[PDB]
Amino acid sequence: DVSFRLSGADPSSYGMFIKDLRNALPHTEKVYNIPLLLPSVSGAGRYLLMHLFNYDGNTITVAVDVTNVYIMGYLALTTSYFFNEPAADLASQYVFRSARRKITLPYSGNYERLQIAAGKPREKIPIGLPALDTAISTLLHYDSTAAAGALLVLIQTTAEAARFKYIEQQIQERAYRDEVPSSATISLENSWSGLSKQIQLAQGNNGVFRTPTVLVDSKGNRVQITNVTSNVVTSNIQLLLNTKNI
Ligand SMILES: CC(=O)N[C@@H]1[C@@H](O)[C@H](O[C@@H]2O[C@H](CO)[C@@H](O)[C@H](O)[C@@H]2O)[C@@H](CO)O[C@H]1O
Ligand SMILES: *[C@@H]1O[C@H](CO)[C@@H](O)[C@H](O)[C@H]1NC(C)=O
């Protein structure tokens, strides 16, 4: 399992959590020095449990699929909650079985569905460590509209930061003040599967992407990624989604 406490948290302790979360995901191979997530993991071993604690010390446990870093559901007190999707229903056969009750959320876990439920796109929802404290608090008692926004914060400040060094740094900059994600952050989230695929196809193709990935950069300018020498590949992406799952 991995853990993070918002009480006393700083950029340093958040960076330790994100390192722990990365190191908890199994791999047997690296591709261009980046860990390649497993094609599949059978049984309960396919779920990592993240124990998150709000500033007041209350906690939820989040279940993460180790092959794709997708959050499946979470436990809050004696109630489990799962996204309305087959992967999550399958996860509910393995995790938080001891919960008194299981609620299926009224939406799947994809960004588009969550944004619909929350009533706003990611671009307008501030993220940061204070926003993560709020999200944990919100998830502690069921409210499916408030939970959608909370989950958009939770996904970005955990899974997306594990996947991209730049996003981890963006959250560290928001340790004590929330701010909506940069356009580059949104860009990277949206391109993770694409990037992971192109880096894996570059093996067999002399480090060259079969198809170029379009991204927005730090200064807000729109760049094209064509090969593994790009900073996105050498210094940013930390985990690769297996092409078997793409
Ligand atoms: C990173 C994380 O924990 N969660 C989200 C994913 O939920 C989401 O994936 C989508 O949701 C499900 C698979 O979980 C599926 O119904 C969709 O087709 C889609 O793949 C993803 C993109 O919205 O964002 C991740 O970060
Ligand atoms: C690889 O990407 C770099 C930019 O990071 C670019 O300058 C170079 O021309 C590209 N080469 C190929 C073969 O794509």
Side-chain angles (χ1 to χ4, degrees):
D1 300 4
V2 294
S3 295
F4 181 60
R5 294 168 170 81
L6 273 293
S7 188
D10 60 4
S12 183
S13 70
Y14 172 68
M16 293 189 277
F17 157 61
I18 293 300
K19 174 191 287 196
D20 295 346
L21 173 54
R22 286 171 186 147
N23 285 161
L25 306 173
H27 66 276
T28 50
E29 198 181 328
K30 304 183 173 181
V31 172
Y32 294 105
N33 202 40
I34 313 146
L36 175 64
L37 295 174
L38 303 175
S40 58
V41 177
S42 62
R46 177 193 200 97
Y47 309 106
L48 166 68
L49 302 179
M50 304 192 290
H51 303 289
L52 304 170
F53 299 81
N54 73 4
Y55 177 81
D56 289 335
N58 283 318
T59 184
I60 63 170
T61 302
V62 184
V64 181
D65 177 319
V66 308
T67 74
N68 45 30
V69 217
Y70 290 160
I71 285 175
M72 291 300 92
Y74 51 96
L75 176 68
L77 198 27
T78 54
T79 303
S80 66
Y81 300 80
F82 291 94
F83 286 122
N84 189 198
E85 74 195 25
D89 180 63
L90 169 64
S92 75
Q93 309 199 49
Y94 299 97
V95 295
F96 314 140
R97 296 285 302 271
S98 69
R100 287 181 101 249
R101 77 170 163 174
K102 179 176 80 174
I103 291 172
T104 307
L105 299 163
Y107 32 80
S108 67
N110 73 91
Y111 275 145
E112 290 71 43
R113 291 313 185 178
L114 283 166
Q115 284 171 168
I116 293 177
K120 29 175 81 179
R122 277 168 280 159
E123 290 93 339
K124 298 199 186 295
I125 300 167
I127 61 178
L129 293 186
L132 182 55
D133 172 73
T134 302
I136 294 163
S137 299
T138 284
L139 298 176
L140 281 162
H141 297 103
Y142 178 63
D143 180 324
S144 63
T145 297
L151 288 161
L152 292 162
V153 177
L154 171 76
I155 291 163
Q156 300 179 268
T157 52
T158 61
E160 302 289 14
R163 294 164 178 158
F164 297 100
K165 266 275 178 197
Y166 173 81
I167 293 183
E168 173 190 8
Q169 293 161 339
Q170 290 294 112
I171 303 310
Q172 288 172 311
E173 286 190 10
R174 286 152 171 75
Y176 317 114
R177 171 178 71 181
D178 302 323
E179 186 180 327
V180 290
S182 69
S183 291
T185 292
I186 299 299
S187 184
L188 292 172
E189 298 172 349
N190 282 346
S191 308
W192 182 62
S193 175
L195 284 163
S196 292
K197 182 182 198 169
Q198 301 298 319
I199 292 166
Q200 277 164 95
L201 286 159
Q203 178 52 238
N205 191 232
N206 292 307
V208 175
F209 287 18
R210 306 271 176 179
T211 307
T213 292
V214 195
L215 292 175
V216 170
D217 67 39
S218 296
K219 339 271 302 175
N221 291 306
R222 160 250 173 247
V223 73
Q224 278 218 332
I225 313 292
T226 61
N227 68 79
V228 301
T229 74
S230 167
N231 277 322
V232 188
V233 186
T234 59
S235 317
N236 193 346
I237 195 159
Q238 300 293 308
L239 306 160
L240 301 176
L241 181 54
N242 204 295
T243 47
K244 293 195 179 190
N245 299 310
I246 307 168

